Amino acid sequence: FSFKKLLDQCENQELEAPGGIATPPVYGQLLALYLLHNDMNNARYLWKRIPPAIKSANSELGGIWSVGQRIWQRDFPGIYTTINAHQWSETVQPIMEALRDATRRRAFALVSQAYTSIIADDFAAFVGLPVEEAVKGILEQGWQADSTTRMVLPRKPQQLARLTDYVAFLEN
């Protein structure tokens, strides 16, 4: 609820502009927020909306688009590298800190649903952390893991008023 209150605040600022062009940081926030909501079509159209002159002026905008290109191809092992290729200032940094978590949870849901057996090499590149999940996942979440072959096995875990509305409509 609190997050939604900030979402609609940035929406209208771009529409009203003294000359049809808003300040650079407003443009960057909308593009990054589109990535967080997985709305890829509007994110692509926003990039096409920015004039070329301002686009080349600020390379910070280009850093958002390079990450957006990877997530547009659903390249899970590649988005984690582009999100760290550039350095984002603290004004836009917290938004990226939430997009990374959203991508991380998205891979977890996709693997558990679309895969019955997945190589540990490929699964680590999906979830994003090939650091400490190798040993922690065996005993905590209960997923049986087999070494050498490296196969992971995901496992699955008031009306009365409505009715009288129907009759009052049908009989009349």
């Binding site: 009306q159 009365l160 009715l163 129907y166 009759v167 049908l170 009989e171």
Partner: protein, 306 residues
């Protein structure tokens, strides 16, 4: 309940359930003067039998045992409906397959009607009924002949046939209301075989009305307050399962009627789509009523004590 249910019952004034019990003399005179049943022939399609009349007819039919019994039924008409408000027995003697009403019934009819007019019975004779002890509810040849004779001169008249043996052996009343066609008039055009099997040879000579029953508010209250097995059977009636097959049959002939309406509307003058829509609304309303009963039972019993 206050204002909500104060005027919702209003025992001082007759409810909408007791409306049918009021006799309008002027309306009766107007409808009998107009004679709307002379132009058409499938005019009357519904027969509304009161609770007391049905009970008296059933008890009379069973009292004869294996011998036929007969009597008259008072009532009126309203639109396409024949309403039977009462019934009264005749002092006849008959055998297992023949009842004649020779000479004591004809005096009893007039004398009983005269006596009933004295104590405020404004209805006139509307039909005659007889029992078929053990061979279904149908009109025999002589039954069809006497029905024609009654209908040709006393124009409003419906023949009711009861079956005490099947009523007792099945647990539900076996009754049928019928009307007949004029002499040598209207020969309209797996069905014929079963039709002659369960009806008589004169299947096309008469048609069967749709029989429904009604009751007043005082009758309803007295019946539901008679035994404890009537509100227990309401809180556990379990509709949508007692009569699911009837619902499927209604959906089937609804589909047939919809096909006929689609055929008609693409190009006698009856507007079949309206009747199909009315039938669909009716059956959907029974289905939703059953679901409402189930929801009320679930909220009353299941949602108590965690």
């Amino acid at each position: 309940a206050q204002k909500t249910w104060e005027l919702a019952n209003n025992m001082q004034e007759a409810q909408s359930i007791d409306e049918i019990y009021k006799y309008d003399k002027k309306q009766q005179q107007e409808i009998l003067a107009a004679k709307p049943w002379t132009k058409d022939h499938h005019y009357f399609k519904y027969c509304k039998i009161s609770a007391l009349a049905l009970l008296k007819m059933v008890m009379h039919a069973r009292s004869g045992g294996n011998l036929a019994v007969m009597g008259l039924m008072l009532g009126k008409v309203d639109g396409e409906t024949m309403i039977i408000m009462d019934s009264f027995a005749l002092p006849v003697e008959g055998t297992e397959t023949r009842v004649n009403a020779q000479a004591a019934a004809y005096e009893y009819m007039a004398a009983y009607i005269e006596n009933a007019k004295q104590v405020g019975r404004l209805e006139n004779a509307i039909g005659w009924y007889h029992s078929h002890p053990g061979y279904g509810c149908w009109l025999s040849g002589i039954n069809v002949s006497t029905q024609m004779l009654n209908q040709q001169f006393q124009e409003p008249f419906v023949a009711v046939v009861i079956d005490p043996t099947r009523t007792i052996s099945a647990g539900k009343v076996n009754l049928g209301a019928f009307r007949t066609y004029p002499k040598g008039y209207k020969p309209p055009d797996t069905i014929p075989l079963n039709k002659i099997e369960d009806f008589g040879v004169h299947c096309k000579q008469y048609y069967a009305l749709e029989v429904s029953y009604f009751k007043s508010s005082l009758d309803r209250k007295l019946l539901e307050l008679l035994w404890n097995k009537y509100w227990v059977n309401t809180l556990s009636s379990s509709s949508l399962l007692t009569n699911a097959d009837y619902t499927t049959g209604q959906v089937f002939d609804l589909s047939e009627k919809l096909e006929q309406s689609e055929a008609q509307l693409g190009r006698k003058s009856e507007d079949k789509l309206a009747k199909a829509t009315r039938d669909s609304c009716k059956t959907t309303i029974e289905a939703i009523h059953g679901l409402m009963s189930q929801v009320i039972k679930d909220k009353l019993f299941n949602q108590i004590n965690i």
